[PDB]
C-alpha cells in the first residue's frame, strides 16, 4: 500500500519508457518520494533484470545502502539477500540469486578495474549523486566511457539538485532525456532581515523566543555553523526556560551533529508528550537522510562548516563558509512536510543574490591521490584524457603525482614502478599505509603492521566520555601505556582485545569501541585476501620484542611525516613546518626528541598532529641515504 | 564561567558560609560557590 501511495507510481510507464528509449535518463526528485526504493522494483517488474540481468544501484553511503537494501528486500516479501542484497566497502552481503544489488562507489570502481566493461550488468542506476562525492564523480566519468563502448548498458541518474543541464551537455543532448518529477510541497514563505546582522546566533535565539511566544505549536529546526555553538544554544535556552512565561510552551533543546554517539542521535526522534516543543540544534546533519516529522519553523544562519585540505602543507582545516543557494532552498523546503511552515533566513535578499548556486564537488574538495592511483591502475598514462565533469586543479594533480613519485609508486617516467606500483594500485587504502603492508613481506612481520593498518583505517579505538568516567577511562587505559608511542599502545590493546575472547563487558569496562575493532577485523581479513592475491603469506610475526623493524617499515610508509622537538614546545617537520602535538596523545609533554605522525589537522593558530609515535635518529639517517 | 542568576541553592550556601565564617572573609566564602567572585558575594550579601 505504501508502494502505491508514493507519487512515482503514476510515472512508472513514463519512467520505463524513458529508461528504455534513452541510453541515459536523468531523474530529478525529492528524497523519500520513492526514487531510491521503487525504481528497482519498477524496472524489475518491467523485466530489465530478467534472464541473468542484474539491477545495480549505487548508494554512496554505507548505512543508507544497507538500510535501503533491507527495506527493498522486506517490501518485496523476499528473504534478505535472496533477491536484493547490499555490498558496502569492506562488507559484502550478496548472493548469486540476488537481482537488486545496492553497491558502494569504491567497490564498483574496483569492479571496473577488474572488469572494464561490466558484462554482468545490463543497467546501473546512480543514486544520491547530488552529494558529489569523489568516488561518485570518478564513477560517473568512467561510466560515460562504458556507455560509450557499450550500447546495451543503461544509466538512470537520480539527483536531488538541479544539475540536469550540465549533465545533458556533458553526456550529449541526443542521448539524454531531461525529466523532472512533480512532487507536492506546502508553500513555504521566507522571511528576511532588512539589515545585516552582527551576531547571527543572537538573532536566531531572538526569533526562536518570538516563535515560541507568538506562534502555534511546532518543532523548530535551526541551522548553525558547527558544534561549538550547540552548547551556547543549550545554555541560552535553559536560561530562557527558567524565565519562561506561563503562556509559552516548555521548549526542549536537542543537539544534532556528526560527533555524537548514536544514542544521542536517537534522542531527537523521542516523542515528548504534553506541552513540549522540540528545537533541534543541527549543524548540517538535518539536511540529508534525516526525517523528523512535525518540523514547521526553520531559522537558517547561512553559515556551514566544512573541510578543506591544503596540498602544499598536507593539512586539513574546518572552515566556515556561507551556504550555497541550493542549500538555502533545501533548508527552506525542509520545513513544511506535514503542515504549512515558515522559514526565517538571517540575511537580506541582496545577500542571497551573491552566493554561488551549488556546492563544489568532493572530487574538487578531497585528496586525488587515490584517484590518480585508480586511473593509473586502469592504464591511463595521461591524466588529461579522462572525461572529468569539472577539471580538477592542475596544481593538485602535479602535487599528488610528485607525492606519489617520492613515495616510489611512480617511476621517473610516471609509470607504475615494479610490482610495487601495480600492487599499490590494487589496494583500496592510501598508498602511504599500503607501502608498509607491501614491504612487510621482506621483513616477516606482516601481522602487526596489518593490525596497525586495520586500526588506522577503522578509526579511533578508544572512547572518551565527557563525564567523570574520563578519569575511569584513564585508569582503564592505565594498564596499556606504551613508552614507545600511541601506535604500539594500539597494537597492545588490539592484541589483548583478541586475547580477551571478544568480551563486550570487557569493552565496556575498558571503554573500548568494539565496532571499530570489528571493522578493523574485517579490514585485516580483506587485506589478508589482498596479499594472498599476490601469494604473500600472512602468518609472519616477529617472535622478538624488538619493534625496531616494524618501525623501519613505518618510516618507509611515513617518510614525509617526521618531526623533531623545538625548544618552544612545538615540533619542526622535515619540511620546515611548525606543528603542535594533540592533547589526546600520550606523548603530550614527554619531550621526545624525534617524532613521527600520520595525520595533520590545522586550526586557526596551531597545526595539530595525530597518531604520535617516537623514533630514533639513526634509523631515519640510514633510511634516507638509501 | 563566572556569574549567573544566583539560584536559591547558591544563596543558602552563602547564608550558611556567612554564619560559619563572618562578614570579612568573602574570598573564603566564594571558594564554595565556584561560579561567583568575592566581590559578587559581597554585593549580594549587602544588597539582598
Amino acid at each position: 500500500i505504501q508502494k502505491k501511495l508514493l507519487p512515482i507510481t503514476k510515472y512508472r510507464n513514463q519512467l520505463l519508457y524513458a529508461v528504455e528509449q534513452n541510453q541515459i535518463t536523468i531523474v530529478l526528485g525529492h528524497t523519500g518520494c520513492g526514487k531510491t526504493t521503487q525504481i528497482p522494483q519498477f524496472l524489475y517488474e518491467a523485466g530489465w533484470a530478467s534472464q541473468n540481468g542484474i539491477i545495480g544501484c549505487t548508494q554512496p553511503r554505507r548505512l543508507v545502502a544497507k538500510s535501503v537494501s533491507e527495506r527493498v528486500s522486506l517490501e518485496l516479501n523476499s528473504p534478505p539477500g535472496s533477491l536484493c542484497g547490499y555490498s558496502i566497502q569492506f562488507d559484502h552481503n550478496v548472493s548469486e540469486k540476488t537481482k537488486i544489488k545496492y553497491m558502494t562507489d569504491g567497490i564498483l570502481l574496483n569492479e571496473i578495474f577488474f572488469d572494464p566493461l561490466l558484462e554482468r550488468y545490463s543497467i546501473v542506476i546512480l543514486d544520491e549523486v547530488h552529494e558529489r562525492t569523489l568516488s561518485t564523480d570518478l564513477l560517473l566519468g568512467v561510466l560515460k566511457r562504458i556507455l560509450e563502448k557499450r550500447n546495451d548498458f543503461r544509466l538512470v541518474l537520480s539527483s536531488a539538485s538541479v544539475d540536469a543541464n550540465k549533465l545533458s551537455q556533458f553526456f550529449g543532448q541526443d542521448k539524454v532525456c531531461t525529466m523532472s518529477i512533480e512532487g507536492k510541497l506546502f508553500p513555504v514563505e521566507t522571511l528576511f532581515l532588512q539589515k545585516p546582522t552582527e551576531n547571527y546566533v543572537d538573532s536566531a535565539i531572538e526569533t526562536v523566543i518570538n516563535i515560541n511566544s507568538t506562534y502555534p505549536p511546532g518543532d523548530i529546526l535551526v541551522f548553525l555553523s558547527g558544534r561549538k555553538e550547540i552548547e551556547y544554544c543549550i545554555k541560552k535556552i535553559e536560561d530562557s526556560l527558567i524565565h519562561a512565561s506561563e503562556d509559552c510552551q516548555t521548549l526542549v533543546p536537542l543537539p544534532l551533529h556528526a560527533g555524537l554517539t548514536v544514542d544521542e542521535q536517537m534522542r531527537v526522534f523521542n516523542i515528548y508528550d504534553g506541552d513540549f516543543r522540540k528545537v533541534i540544534f543541527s549543524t548540517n546533519i538535518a539536511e540529508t537522510s534525516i526525517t523528523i516529522d512535525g518540523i514547521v519553523y526553520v531559522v537558517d544562519s547561512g553559515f556551514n562548516k566544512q573541510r578543506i585540505y591544503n596540498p602544499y602543507t598536507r593539512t586539513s582545516k574546518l572552515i566556515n563558509v556561507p551556504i550555497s543557494k541550493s542549500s538555502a532552498i533545501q533548508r527552506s523546503g525542509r520545513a513544511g512536510r506535514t503542515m504549512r511552515g515558515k522559514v526565517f533566513r538571517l540575511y537580506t535578499e541582496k545577500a542571497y543574490s551573491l552566493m554561488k548556486e551549488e556546492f563544489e564537488a568532493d572530487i574538487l574538495n578531497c585528496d586525488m591521490s587515490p584517484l590518480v592511483l585508480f586511473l593509473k591502475g586502469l592504464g591511463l598514462k595521461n591524466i588529461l584524457q579522462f572525461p572529468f565533469f569539472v577539471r580538477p586543479p592542475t596544481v593538485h594533480l602535479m602535487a599528488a603525482l610528485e607525492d606519489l613519485y617520492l613515495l616510489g609508486v611512480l617511476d621517473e617516467s610516471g609509470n607504475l614502478t615494479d610490482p610495487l606500483g601495480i600492487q599499490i594500485s590494487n589496494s583500496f587504502l592510501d598508498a602511504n599505509i599500503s607501502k608498509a603492508l607491501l614491504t612487510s613481506n621482506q621483513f616477516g612481520c606482516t601481522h602487526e603492521i596489518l593490525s596497525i593498518a586495520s586500526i588506522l583505517t577503522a578509526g579511533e579505538v578508544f572512547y572518551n566520555p565527557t563525564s567523570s568516567s574520563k578519569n575511569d577511562a584513564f585508569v582503564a587505559h592505565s594498564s596499556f601505556f606504551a613508552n614507545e608511542g600511541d601506535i604500539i599502545t594500539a597494537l597492545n590493546v588490539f592484541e589483548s582485545f583478541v586475547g580477551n575472547k571478544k568480551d563486550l563487558q570487557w569493552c565496556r569496562k575498558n571503554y573500548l569501541n568494539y565496532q571499530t575493532l570489528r571493522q578493523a577485523l574485517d579490514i585485516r581479513t580483506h587485506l589478508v585476501r589482498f596479499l594472498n592475491k599476490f601469494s604473500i603469506p600472512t602468518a609472519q610475526r616477529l617472535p622478538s620484542s624488538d619493534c625496531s623493524k616494524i618501525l623501519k617499515c613505518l618510516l618507509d610508509g611515513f617518510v614525509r611525516n617526521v618531526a623533531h622537538l623545538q625548544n618552544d614546545g612545538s615540533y619542526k617537520t622535515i619540511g620546515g613546518k611548525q606543528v603542535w602535538l594533540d592533547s589526546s596523545s600520550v606523548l603530550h609533554e614527554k619531550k621526545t626528541p624525534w617524532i613521527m605522525y600520520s595525520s595533520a589537522v590545522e586550526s586557526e593558530t596551531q597545526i595539530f598532529v595525530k597518531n604520535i609515535s617516537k623514533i630514533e635518529s639513526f634509523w631515519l639517517d640510514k633510511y634516507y641515504k638509501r | 564561567l563566572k556569574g549567573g542568576a544566583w539560584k536559591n541553592t547558591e544563596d543558602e550556601i552563602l547564608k550558611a558560609a556567612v554564619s560559619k565564617y563572618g562578614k570579612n572573609q568573602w574570598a573564603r566564602i566564594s571558594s564554595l560557590l565556584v561560579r561567583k567572585t568575592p566581590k559578587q558575594c559581597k554585593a549580594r550579601w549587602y544588597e539582598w
Binding site: 551576531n199 602535479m398 610528485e402 617520492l406 | -
Partner: protein
C-alpha cells in the same frame, strides 16, 4: 621503567599542575634548570668514582689501546640533547615541496596548457588568505577601525613583560605605517 604513576596529571592543564618532580619530590636540580645544586652534590664527581684504564705501548700493545669515542664520556642529558641536536641532509624534501622533476612529470601529462587552467578549489585556497569568519552575519560589512593584526638575555620567565621591556633602540616601521600623500582640501 613504569613511566611513574601517570594518574597524577589527570586533567588540570598547565596553570594548575603542581610542580615537576624528578623523584616524586618537589625540587629542582641542575644549575640551568633552577636547582641550587648541580652535579653529584655541588661537585663534579660521581657516586662510584672514576679511574683511567691501564696504558701500555710497544708498537704491538698500543694496538689494544684503541681511540676515544663520543658516547663513552657523555651522560644521559648529553646523549638526549645529542639526539635532539642532529639535523642535516634533507635535500630531496626541499626539492619537491613548497617542481623540477615535476616539470618532467608535466611533460608526462602532456600539459600543453599555454594559458593555465584553474579550479574553484583555488578560490578556496584564496579563502585561506581571506578569513575564517568572526562569528558575524553574511551581510555584515564590518568596520576597518576594529581590525588588527634585537636580543640579549631574558628578564626571567616569571618577571613578565611591560613598558619596561622594549627596545630603546628603535628603527622599525620605516614606511609601512606612513602614507605617501594626503588630501589637502
Amino acid at each position: 621503567f613504569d613511566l611513574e604513576p601517570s594518574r597524577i596529571n589527570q586533567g588540570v592543564p598547565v596553570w594548575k599542575q603542581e610542580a615537576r618532580d624528578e623523584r616524586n619530590r618537589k625540587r629542582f636540580h641542575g644549575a640551568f634548570t633552577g636547582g641550587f645544586s648541580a652535579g653529584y652534590f655541588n661537585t663534579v664527581g660521581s657516586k662510584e668514582g672514576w679511574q683511567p684504564k691501564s696504558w701500555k705501548s710497544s708498537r704491538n700493545e698500543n694496538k689494544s689501546v684503541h681511540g676515544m669515542t663520543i658516547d663513552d664520556i657523555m651522560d644521559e642529558e648529553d646523549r638526549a640533547d645529542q639526539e635532539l641536536s642532529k639535523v642535516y641532509t634533507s635535500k630531496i624534501n626541499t626539492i619537491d615541496t613548497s617542481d623540477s622533476i615535476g616539470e618532467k612529470m608535466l611533460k608526462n601529462l602532456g600539459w600543453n596548457g599555454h594559458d593555465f587552467v584553474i579550479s574553484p578549489f583555488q578560490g578556496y585556497y584564496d579563502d585561506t588568505k581571506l578569513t575564517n569568519q568572526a562569528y558575524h552575519g553574511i551581510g555584515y560589512q564590518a568596520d576597518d577601525v576594529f581590525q588588527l593584526e634585537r636580543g640579549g638575555f631574558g628578564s626571567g620567565v616569571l618577571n613578565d613583560d611591560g613598558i619596561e621591556d622594549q627596545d630603546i633602540y628603535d628603527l622599525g616601521a620605516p614606511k609601512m605605517r606612513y602614507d605617501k600623500s594626503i588630501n589637502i582640501t
